[PDB]
Design a binder for this molecule. Structure first.
Ligand SMILES: CN(C)C(=O)c1ccc2nccnc2c1
Length: 115
C-alpha cells in the first residue's frame, strides 16, 4: 500500500528473455501455422469468429516496439495465439495438434525461465 512495498523482483532482463523464448517458438518446426497473421480475406469464418487474431510476427513486432508493459502481457498474447487456434481448429488436425504442442513447449520455457 502507500510507502509499503514487497522486495523489487529484478525485471531488467525480461525483455531480452521474452525475445529469446519468442525465437525459440519461431524456430520450432510446428510454428508454421502461427508465423503470420491468418489471412482474413481468404479464410471464411475467421474474421467474425476470432475476435482478437494474434500470431508470432505480430507479437514480435509488439515486443520490438515497447508495446508490452510487462512480462505477463507478453504471455497473454502468446496464449491468445493458442486459444484462437483451439477455437477454430479441430483437435485432431495438423494445425490443432500443432497448437497443443507449441503451447506445451511455450509453458515449459515460460516456467523454467521465470517461476
Ligand atoms: C492458426 N491457423 C493457421 C488457423 O487457425 C487456420 C485454420 C484453418 C485454415 N484453413 C484454411 C486456411 N487457413 C487456415 C488457418
Amino acid at each position: 500500500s502507500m510507502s509499503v512495498k514487497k522486495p523489487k523482483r529484478d525485471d531488467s532482463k525480461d525483455l531480452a528473455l521474452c525475445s529469446m523464448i519468442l525465437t525459440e517458438m519461431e524456430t520450432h518446426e510446428d510454428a508454421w501455422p502461427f508465423l503470420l497473421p491468418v489471412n482474413l480475406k481468404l479464410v471464411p469464418g475467421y474474421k467474425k469468429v476470432i475476435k482478437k487474431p494474434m500470431d508470432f510476427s505480430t507479437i514480435r513486432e509488439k515486443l520490438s516496439s515497447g508495446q508490452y508493459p510487462n512480462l505477463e502481457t507478453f504471455a497473454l498474447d502468446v496464449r491468445l495465439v493458442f486459444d484462437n487456434c483451439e477455437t477454430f481448429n479441430e483437435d485432431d488436425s495438423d494445425i490443432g495438434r500443432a497448437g497443443h504442442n507449441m503451447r506445451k513447449y511455450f509453458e515449459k520455457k515460460w516456467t523454467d525461465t521465470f517461476k
